[PDB]
Amino acid sequence: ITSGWTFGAGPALQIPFPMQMAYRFNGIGVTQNVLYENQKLIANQFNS
Amino acid sequence: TAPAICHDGKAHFPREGVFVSNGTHWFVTQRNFYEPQIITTDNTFVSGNCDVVIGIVNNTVYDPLQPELD
Numbered sequence: 530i531t532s533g534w535t536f537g538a539g540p541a542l543q544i545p546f547p548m549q550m551a552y553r554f555n556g557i558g559v560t561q562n563v564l565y566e567n568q569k570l571i572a573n574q575f576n577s
Numbered sequence: 578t579a580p581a582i583c584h585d586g587k588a589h590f591p592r593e594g595v596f597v598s599n600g601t602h603w604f605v606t607q608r609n610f611y612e613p614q615i616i617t618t619d620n621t622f623v624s625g626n627c628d629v630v631i632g633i634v635n636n637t638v639y640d641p642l643q644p645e646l647d
């Protein structure tokens with residue numbers, strides 16, 4: 530949650546979480562603007 | 578860091594990399610090695626307006642065209 534996937538290849542590197550989720554969308558073929566303009570929806574859907 | 582940069586009322590997002598600030602100026606870097614470059618219109622792409630991104634910051638994105646045309 531605080532370091533993403535960096536602690537498994539060396540030192541834990543902090544990065545804010547909203548930006549971690551944007552990277553993760555990029556890794557599946559979705560552009561990052563789709564998350565940032567819908568951040569509230571994805572957080573509501575995850576929490577439910 | 579910041580997710581996007583505002584210029585001319587438009588939101589700019591990095592093609593690859595993250596925005597960083599050294600204390601006084603902002604740069605684009607690749608994510609795996611620190612190597613800053615100036616934020617230009619060839620480094621970024623435009624999508625949406627600066628009203629939907631949380632944490633967007635003001636900066637200058639430089640266009641190479643105008644200083645070539647003096």
Ligand SMILES: *[C@@H]1O[C@H](CO)[C@@H](O[C@@H]2O[C@H](CO)[C@@H](O)[C@H](O)[C@H]2NC(C)=O)[C@H](O)[C@H]1NC(C)=O
Nearest residue numbers: 563566567568569570571572573574575576577
């Ligand atoms: C994408 O789908 C979601 C539902 O999966 C839509 O969100 C719902 O919209 C309805 C109608 O406004 C609301 O009553 C629900 O409360 C919303 N659900 C959640 C979890 O927020 C969303 O509007 C759709 N997006 C578009 C662009 O149509």
Ligand SMILES: *[C@@H]1O[C@H](CO)[C@@H](O[C@@H]2O[C@H](CO)[C@@H](O)[C@H](O)[C@H]2NC(C)=O)[C@H](O)[C@H]1NC(C)=O
Nearest residue numbers: 597598599600601602603604605612613614615
């Ligand atoms: C952040 O980096 C910049 C660029 O290196 C520093 O700003 C100065 O920028 C001018 C050009 O606009 C250069 O001619 C200077 O040599 C730069 N100074 C230095 C010390 O590099 C700026 O100082 C840096 N900020 C911090 C807080 O270190």
Ligand SMILES: *[C@@H]1O[C@H](CO)[C@@H](O[C@@H]2O[C@H](CO)[C@@H](O)[C@H](O)[C@H]2NC(C)=O)[C@H](O)[C@H]1NC(C)=O
Nearest residue numbers: 545546547548578579580581630631632633634
């Ligand atoms: C990150 O969190 C800090 C608090 O830990 C936020 O700082 C506050 O910002 C508000 C305005 O948004 C101020 O009214 C408060 O006084 C600030 N708190 C402190 C302790 O200085 C900061 O805004 C957050 N950053 C983002 C991008 O949301």
Ligand SMILES: *[C@@H]1O[C@H](CO)[C@@H](O[C@@H]2O[C@H](CO)[C@@H](O)[C@H](O)[C@H]2NC(C)=O)[C@H](O)[C@H]1NC(C)=O
Nearest residue numbers: 582583584585586587627632633634635636637
């Ligand atoms: C980033 O720059 C924009 C553009 O100058 C700022 O938008 C202005 O915001 C002020 C209030 O802070 C309004 O009075 C102006 O009308 C806005 N200008 C326009 C053209 O809409 C924005 O506030 C700046 N952001 C920060 C954090 O300073």
